[PDB]
Amino acid sequence: AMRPFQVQIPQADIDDLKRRLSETRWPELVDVGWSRGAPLSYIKELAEYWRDGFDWRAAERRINQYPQFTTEIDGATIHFLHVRSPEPDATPMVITHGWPGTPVEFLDIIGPLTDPRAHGGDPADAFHLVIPSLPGFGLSGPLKSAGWELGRIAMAWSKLMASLGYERYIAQGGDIGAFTSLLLGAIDPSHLAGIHVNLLQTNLSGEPGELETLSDADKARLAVSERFLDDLSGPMKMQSTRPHTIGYMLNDSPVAQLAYLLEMFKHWAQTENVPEDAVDRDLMLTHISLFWFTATGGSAAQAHYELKPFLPITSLIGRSPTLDVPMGVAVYPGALFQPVRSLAERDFKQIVHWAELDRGGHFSAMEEPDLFVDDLRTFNRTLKKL
């Protein structure tokens, strides 16, 4: 049974965040720009704005315009947005965030996807949207028990869609949400209209002849991963081994929680100089505040521990089980991993949609809502012609 939910942060918690922000003990660090983490000049000014200018209550209102629910599945609380189109025949779609994600990434796409008529679009392009928070993340709240490996998440998701009455839906996502959607392919193929992933990593099989078949451009695309592995993989390594330790390090300092996530907003998102290049500052702070207020820094960190075998820091080699479900792929230029189509085609036998976009990074929908919407609309048009 679905229990109506609204975000309502107690006033005392907001007061506590402001107190902690003004009392931050700022470290003495050398100025090397963003090279070793957020520079003091940037993070201090942002932290001050976070305290003095950011309007949490307004952000809370913007989120609460969307119907939300919580339900219990397999021993965990799951929070989700459920936004019905005014078109009854809209195509159901579950959009799943990854780490460090929240449904707030998707505020800018919800309107256009669910109500295209009101956004100058074709009413035939409508979706009904389900936007859940991963177990242990943000509004789903912290975990009371562990063991949430990918297959368990996928099983949960199929139960959710089934109990909402959706017998045919699209599974969409990036990062953890991409894996979840891909696993839905094996777990719930009879109810899956299609899978769409906006972040795809393609592994070499490890078999001899494969490399020779790749062009210089394919190989360069595979080597893109080297930036993440060398420079950006620290948080994933920490979370895949000691997520509790990360918890202690995020839960008791707002600036710690800020500084940690600024890494993704600077480098995972596609930026030039600052996070604001890619994402609106108030949206970013909304996203970040969710983690802080829900105190799920540590519980969310558990996901990397649970998904260790799937981590690119664990292995970049090996065929995935074959997948016959209609599939769409979107390649964002700033994505940390870049898929090679022929490697993708090796395992995924019904890729019906392959799009290469010219801007946007890791948080694709969040960074480039219009591109993302146009893309998903095109994909669904293709599905309907099958």
Under rule CB under 8 A, which residues in 259-278 are in contact with a copy of itself?
259-260, 263
Q: Kindly tell me which residue out of 14, 18, 24, 383 binds a copy of itself, with binding defined by CB under 8 A.
A: 24
Whose Cβ is closer to a copy of itself: residue 213's or residue 241's?
241
To a copy of itself, the closest distance from the beta carbon of 28 in angstroms equals: 4
Under rule CB under 8 A, which residues in 145-204 are in contact with a copy of itself?
145-146
Q: Kindly tell me which residue out of 122, 252, 345, 356 binds a copy of itself, with binding defined by CB under 8 A.
A: 252
Binding residues for a copy of itself, how many (CB under 8 A)?
A: 52
Q: Kindly tell me which residue out of 14, 164, 232, 311 binds a copy of itself, with binding defined by CB under 8 A.
A: 232
Distance CA 120, CA 133 (A): 29
Position of tokens 């075998």? Answer: 309
To a copy of itself, the closest distance from the beta carbon of 339 in angstroms equals: 25
For position 227 contacting a copy of itself by CB under 8 A, the verdict is no
Q: Kindly tell me which residue out of 77, 102, 203, 299 binds a copy of itself, with binding defined by CB under 8 A.
A: 299
Whose Cβ is closer to a copy of itself: residue 186's or residue 238's?
238
For position 305 contacting a copy of itself by CB under 8 A, the verdict is yes
Q: Length of the chain in residues, anyone?
A: 386
For position 29 contacting a copy of itself by CB under 8 A, the verdict is yes
37 forms beta bridges with 35
Question: Looking at the chain, which runs of residues are DSSP E strands?
Answer: 3-5, 68-73, 76-83, 91-96, 127-132, 169-173, 192-197, 327-331, 351-356
CB 160 within 8 Å of CB 315: no
CB 96 within 8 Å of CB 173: yes
Position of tokens 């960190």? Answer: 301
CB 328 within 8 Å of CB 194: yes
Q: Which stretch binds a copy of itself (CB under 8 A): 97-105, 158-166, 208-216, 244-252?
A: 244-252
For position 12 contacting a copy of itself by CB under 8 A, the verdict is no
For the beta sheet containing 68-73, the strands, ordered from the edge strand earlier in sequence to the opposite edge, are 3-5, 68-73, 76-83, 127-132, 91-96, 169-173, 192-197, 327-331, 351-356
With 0-12 / 13-18 / 19 or more C-beta atoms within 10 angstroms meaning exposed / middle / buried, residue 382 is middle
Residues that bind a copy of itself (CB under 8 A): 24-30, 32, 36-39, 43, 142-146, 230-235, 237-238, 240-253, 255-256, 258-260, 263, 295, 297-299, 302, 305
